[PDB]
């Protein structure tokens, strides 16, 4: 139950893992339509 969060200094995600998670999500979306 926040109201208005705000602070600097935070190693947030989406700085390299978004690419990795997406590469995996892309490869899976390929194999999904090709496997069983």
Swiss-Prot record:
Protein origin, superkingdom: Eukaryota
Site (Cleavage): 2-3
Sequence positions bearing Tyrosine amide: 36
Protein name, UniProt field: Neuropeptide Y
Protein species of origin: Sus scrofa
Entire protein: shown range: 10 to 45 of 76
